[PDB]
Write a protein that holds these residues in place. Structure first.
Motif, PDB file in Angstrom:
ATOM      1  N   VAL A 173       0.843  -1.190   0.000  1.00 33.35           N
ATOM      2  CA  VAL A 173       0.000   0.000   0.000  1.00 33.35           C
ATOM      3  C   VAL A 173       0.880   1.243   0.000  1.00 33.35           C
ATOM      4  CG1 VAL A 173      -1.525   1.425   1.407  1.00 33.35           C
ATOM      5  CG2 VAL A 173      -2.000  -1.011   1.046  1.00 33.35           C
ATOM      6  N   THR A 174       1.913   1.199   0.829  1.00 40.71           N
ATOM      7  CA  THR A 174       2.871   2.289   0.972  1.00 40.71           C
ATOM      8  C   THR A 174       3.633   2.563  -0.337  1.00 40.71           C
ATOM      9  OG1 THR A 174       3.117   1.750   3.324  1.00 40.71           O
ATOM     10  CG2 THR A 174       4.856   3.089   2.331  1.00 40.71           C
ATOM     11  N   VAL A 175       4.229   1.530  -0.911  1.00 37.47           N
ATOM     12  CA  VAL A 175       4.963   1.683  -2.163  1.00 37.47           C
ATOM     13  C   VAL A 175       4.095   2.333  -3.245  1.00 37.47           C
ATOM     14  CG1 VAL A 175       6.024   0.475  -4.131  1.00 37.47           C
ATOM     15  CG2 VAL A 175       6.584  -0.212  -1.762  1.00 37.47           C
ATOM     16  N   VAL A 176       2.880   1.824  -3.425  1.00 37.28           N
ATOM     17  CA  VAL A 176       1.998   2.375  -4.440  1.00 37.28           C
ATOM     18  C   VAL A 176       1.585   3.814  -4.136  1.00 37.28           C
ATOM     19  CG1 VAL A 176      -0.241   2.159  -5.602  1.00 37.28           C
ATOM     20  CG2 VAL A 176       1.122   0.125  -5.165  1.00 37.28           C
ATOM     21  N   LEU A 177       1.154   4.087  -2.913  1.00 39.39           N
ATOM     22  CA  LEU A 177       0.717   5.448  -2.577  1.00 39.39           C
ATOM     23  C   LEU A 177       1.824   6.476  -2.531  1.00 39.39           C
ATOM     24  CD1 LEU A 177      -1.920   4.665   0.207  1.00 39.39           C
ATOM     25  CD2 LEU A 177      -2.260   5.025  -2.299  1.00 39.39           C
ATOM     26  N   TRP A 178       2.924   6.149  -1.862  1.00 34.03           N
ATOM     27  CA  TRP A 178       4.051   7.079  -1.736  1.00 34.03           C
ATOM     28  C   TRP A 178       4.683   7.466  -3.072  1.00 34.03           C
ATOM     29  CZ3 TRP A 178       7.545   7.427   3.122  1.00 34.03           C
ATOM     30  CH2 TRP A 178       6.794   7.194   4.292  1.00 34.03           C
ATOM     31  N   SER A 179       4.860   6.493  -3.960  1.00 30.48           N
ATOM     32  CA  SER A 179       5.459   6.789  -5.256  1.00 30.48           C
ATOM     33  C   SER A 179       4.641   7.840  -6.035  1.00 30.48           C
ATOM     34  CB  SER A 179       5.580   5.508  -6.091  1.00 30.48           C
ATOM     35  OG  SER A 179       4.305   5.063  -6.498  1.00 30.48           O
TER      36      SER A 179
END
Ligand SMILES: CC(C)CCCCCCCCCCCC[C@@H](C)CCCCCCCC(C)C
Ligand SMILES: CC(C)CCCCCCCCCCCC[C@@H](C)CCCCCCCC(C)C
Ligand SMILES: *C/C=C(C)/C=C/C=C(C)/C=C/C1=C(C)CCCC1(C)C
Length: 227
Positions: A173-179
């Motif tokens: 979730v983090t990788v997708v949202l943060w990028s």
């Protein structure tokens, strides 16, 4: 002053607030020491976001910065939020896979750099130099993402299945949202000025709520926070 983007600031305020309260009620009932630590951290995240969203809604955290021959509206309040919220989210992930102290220090240090240079860039008056700070900030973001993907995922292999599985979802979730943040910054009011501030605000609100309340629900609803 009825700025076009206030409806999204108002909606972000409401969701961050609802999320906070719910996590607060849910965390107060728990007795496990370890689960409580996760609850306090995770509740603090939307609590902070709430305050900054409410402030911006009331006309604070906005400053006009000159560049490109225009007086560009820049919400600096977002960085006061992210300065503390992003490292707390990383802490949640680190405590989950029982990362080492050195690793946590490097991630928070890199996170501070990401937010700091991000803000410097959002305030730079030399158009082209805005993108140099953005480039440096994105690089630090990539360091963080690399560590969560290559370092932590490896670390999660020492934990039970349900702990490793919970981490993988939060990691994803983090990788997708943060990028997405750097892209929004680049095409929005801080960068190329292609996407309008009202839409940009809508985008950051969706990512913020998702990255905090969404993330929070996934984590706190799991059995992985128990010692
Ligand atoms: C012109 C229109 C003037 C009024 C605009 C609406 C004012 C009321 C809604 C916004 C308020 C302040 C922000 C938070 C709203 C939370 C609403 C309930 C969410 C649940
Ligand atoms: C047992 C309790 C475990 C959790 C303790 C609280 C963790 C969250 C608060 C502390 C965090 C790290 C330090 C900076 C906190 C800044 C909070 C917002 C200030 C504005
Ligand atoms: C709750 C808020 C979250 C999870 C915020 C995440 C924010 C980022 C990953 C921001 C990244 C940025 C860059 C890579 C470069 C330019 C400026 C930033 C700070 C918008």
């Amino acid at each position: 002053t009825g700025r076009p983007e206030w409806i999204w600031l108002a909606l972000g305020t409401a969701l961050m607030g609802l999320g906070t309260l719910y996590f607060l009620v849910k965390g107060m009932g728990v007795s496990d020491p370890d689960a409580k630590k996760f609850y306090a951290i995770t509740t603090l995240v939307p609590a902070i976001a709430f305050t900054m969203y409410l402030s911006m809604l009331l006309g604070y955290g906005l400053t006009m910065v000159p560049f490109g021959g225009e007086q560009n509206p820049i919400y600096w309040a977002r960085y006061a939020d992210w300065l503390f919220t992003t490292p707390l989210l990383l802490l949640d992930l680190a405590l989950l896979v029982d990362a080492d102290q050195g690793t946590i220090l490097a991630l928070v240090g890199a996170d501070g750099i990401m937010i700091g240079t991000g803000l410097v860039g959002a305030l730079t008056k030399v158009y082209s130099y805005r993108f140099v700070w953005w480039a440096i900030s994105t690089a630090a973001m990539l360091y963080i993402l690399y560590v969560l993907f290559f370092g932590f995922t490896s670390k999660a292999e020492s934990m039970r299945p349900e702990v490793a599985s919970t981490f993988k979802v939060l990691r994803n979730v983090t990788v997708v949202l943060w990028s997405a943040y750097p892209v929004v910054w680049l095409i929005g009011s801080e960068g190329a000025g292609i996407v309008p501030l009202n839409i940009e605000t809508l985008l950051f609100m969706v990512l913020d709520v998702s990255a905090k309340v969404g993330f929070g629900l996934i984590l706190l609803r799991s059995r992985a926070i128990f010692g």
